[PDB]
């Protein structure tokens, strides 16, 4: 059993990427945000408060013949975003890219925060972190990936995110076609329930590589690259005019500036993020101030290799019984 689905950025900034997923019988197709930094499959639904849905596609569990209430069961989730969502829970048949999983927990939004309501292109999240992070009560549920694992040819998915362009998520196999050279695998710590790993250092542009251990999480569900304040200060030092803004809340740089690339280390290998990836465009419509893609982790508590770093690479999430993270160039 394998599965490939095309994943598509939601806007010209690549803020996020949506993937179509089939839920229910017959299928209702919703566009979900694949999130390797959470563990809940949650969807906008026929129970979602009507003043809280826009032009999202909703999941109607009463039109699925496979859909069943998980009685008493209940969820609540919160994001680094400050984003929130909650409700009750169904099991149903979920399909991604022709890979089918039956009796998947599909967590049906009753409530949803403003940030989600104003995002019309995202119909819900599909969490692909480790199941310990799942939020359903009183009985914790397993992720889609966990439910598929056993059925899979290999207990693996890959992420191949595009810069300004569609990409692919594969399940159960590695497209040797999709990257260049070698995959470099590196150890994953599961203890916090993240795809948590340890980078071996960094370079800015054509600069010397500094060997220093950077611990953080592979998170397809975060837009930006979040790195320690030291690292992030060295990057923007090389961009004339760049400054940390208290008003906008991060580093901004004049839009007419050239952005150096950013290299990070996985084992003895190196991934270069071209500087174009790091431009997130005018902080406001008309401004000549542009928002940077590398921002300080100091206020999160954790470093995040979000989409800015992952879309520079071909990324393997090896969900074996000792999990690993592979990076290749593409």
- Give the separation between CA 242 and CA 255, rounded to whole angstroms: 10
Between 203 and 252, CB nearer to other proteins: 252
Stretch that binds other proteins, among 101-109, 201-209, 238-246, 294-302 (CB under 8 A): 294-302
Question: x/- site string to other proteins, residues 93 to 132, per CB under 8 A?
Answer: --------------------------------x-x-x---
- Give the separation between CA 306 and CA 296, rounded to whole angstroms: 13
Stretch that binds other proteins, among 38-46, 180-188, 198-206, 227-235 (CB under 8 A): 38-46
85 is a site residue for other proteins (CB under 8 A): no
For residue 206, indicate whether it is catalytic.
no
For residue 310, report the phi and psi dihedrals to the nearest 5 degrees. Answer: -65, -35
Q: How far is CA 32 from CA 123, 238, 260, in A?
A: 6, 37, 33
248 is a site residue for other proteins (CB under 8 A): no
Contact 210, 227 (CB under 8 A): no
Q: Which of 4, 14, 33, 35 is catalytic?
A: 35
Residues binding other proteins: what is the number (CB under 8 A)? Answer: 33
For residue 284, indicate whether it is catalytic.
no
Between 184 and 220, CB nearer to other proteins: 220
Between 125 and 183, CB nearer to other proteins: 125
**Residue 65 has which token pair?**
């013949």
Between 77 and 328, CB nearer to other proteins: 77
Q: What angle do CA 269, 274, 277 make, to 5 degrees?
A: 120
16 is a site residue for other proteins (CB under 8 A): yes
35 is a site residue for other proteins (CB under 8 A): yes
- Give the separation between CA 60 and CA 70, rounded to whole angstroms: 15
| Bridge-based pairing state of the strands 17-23 and 28-35 | antiparallel
Tell me the HSE value of 199 on the side-chain side, using a 13 A CA sphere. Answer: 25
Q: Which of 85, 199, 296, 297 is catalytic?
A: 199
DSSP helix/strand/coil, 306: coil
Rule CB under 8 A: which residues touch other proteins?
Answer: 15-16, 33-40, 77-81, 83, 125, 127, 129, 133, 135, 219-224, 280, 300-302, 304, 306
Catalytic annotation, residues: 35, 199
């Amino acid at each position: 059993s394998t599965g490939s689905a095309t994943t598509t950025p939601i806007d010209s900034l690549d803020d996020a990427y949506i993937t179509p997923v089939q839920i229910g019988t017959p299928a209702q197709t919703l566009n979900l945000d694949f999130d390797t930094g959470s563990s809940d499959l949650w969807v906008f639904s026929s129970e979602t408060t009507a003043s809280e849905v826009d032009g999202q596609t909703i999941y109607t569990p009463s039109k699925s013949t496979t859909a069943k209430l998980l009685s008493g069961a209940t969820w609540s989730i919160s994001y680094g975003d400050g984003s929130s969502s909650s409700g009750d829970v169904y099991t149903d048949t979920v399909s991604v890219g022709g890979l089918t999983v039956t009796g998947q927990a599909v967590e049906s939004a009753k409530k949803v925060s403003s940030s989600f309501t104003e995002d019309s292109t995202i119909d819900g999240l599909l969490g692909l972190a480790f199941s310990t992070l799942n939020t359903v009560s009183p009985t914790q549920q397993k992720t889609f990936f966990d439910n598929a694992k056993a059925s899979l040819d290999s207990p693996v998915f890959t992420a191949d995110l595009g810069y300004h362009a569609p990409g692919t998520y594969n399940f159960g196999f590695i497209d040797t076609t999709a990257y260049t050279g070698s995959i470099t695998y590196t150890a994953v710590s599961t203890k916090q329930g993240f795809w948590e790993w340890t980078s071996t250092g960094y370079a800015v542009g054509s600069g010397t590589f500094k060997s220093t251990s950077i611990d953080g999480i592979a998170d397809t569900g975060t837009t930006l690259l979040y790195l320690p304040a030291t690292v992030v200060s060295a990057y923007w030092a090389q961009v004339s005019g760049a400054k940390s803004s208290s008003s906008v809340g991060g580093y901004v740089f004049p839009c007419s500036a050239t952005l150096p690339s950013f290299t990070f280390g996985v084992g003895s290998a190196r991934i270069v993020i071209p500087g174009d990836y790091i431009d997130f465009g005018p902080i406001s419509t008309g401004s000549s101030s542009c928002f940077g893609g590398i921002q300080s982790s100091a206020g999160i508590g954790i470093n995040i290799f979000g989409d800015v770093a992952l879309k520079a690479a071909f990324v393997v999430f090896n969900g074996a019984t000792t999990p690993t993270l592979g990076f290749a160039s593409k």
